[PDB]
Design a protein around this ligand. Structure first.
Ligand SMILES: [N+]
Ligand SMILES: [N+]
Length: 198
């Protein structure tokens, strides 16, 4: 594209081609995010700490989104539609692919959506970094039963299934198609846009 790509290595957020982006890590210098044209970005990490990087929207909602990804973890990493709510403070992850560790937790059934079935889990995070600072909060999970690296995510269907399982979201903060991980190494290239049939 005409876009002059840049590479981010320090915690930050902003907009790029109308897309909200977020980069966060506790191991600066060991992970980078490259901003591409439109809703595209790449990541690269080597012996990192915690990291999360993605493009999407500064205010989340019941969007139907379509993505395409190259996802290459050597350890614990996820390819995931990732977001936050406030009141209550909740982090949620719709997990499309994973590395050496598949997420698990308190199992609350399944949701079938977008050509596949997802396991539903709730976990808790204690005194951890958040959009509200150091906090204890819920994590809502949908983990696809088979990995994939492209397709359409009907976010509304996950929200509804969680609600039926008694997993209640607050007022939406950001919502990104993220590459997230803990330590080890890897790379990703991810393209996201709103669109596709719900
Ligand atoms: N750690
Ligand atoms: N993690």
């Amino acid at each position: 594209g005409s876009h002059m790509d840049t590479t981010i290595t320090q915690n930050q957020t902003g907009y790029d081609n109308g897309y909200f982006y977020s980069f966060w890590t506790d191991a600066p210098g060991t992970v980078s995010m490259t901003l591409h044209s439109g809703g595209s970005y790449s990541t690269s990490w080597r012996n990192t700490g915690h990291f999360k990087a993605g493009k999407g929207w500064s205010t989340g909602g019941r969007r139907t989104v379509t993505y395409n990804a190259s996802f290459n973890p050597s350890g614990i990493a996820y390819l995931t539609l990732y977001g936050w709510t406030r009141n209550p403070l909740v982090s949620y992850l719709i997990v499309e692919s994973w590395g050496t560790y598949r997420p698990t937790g308190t199992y609350k059934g399944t949701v079938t959506t977008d050509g596949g079935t997802y396991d539903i889990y709730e976990t808790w995070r204690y005194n951890a970094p958040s959009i509200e600072g150091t906090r204890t909060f819920q994590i809502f999970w949908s983990v696809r039963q088979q990995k994939r690296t492209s397709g359409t995510i009907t976010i509304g269907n996950h929200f509804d299934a969680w609600a039926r399982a008694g997993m209640n979201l607050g007022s939406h903060d950001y919502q990104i198609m993220a590459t997230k991980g803990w330590q080890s190494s890897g790379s990703s290239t991810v393209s996201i846009s709103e669109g596709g049939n719900p």
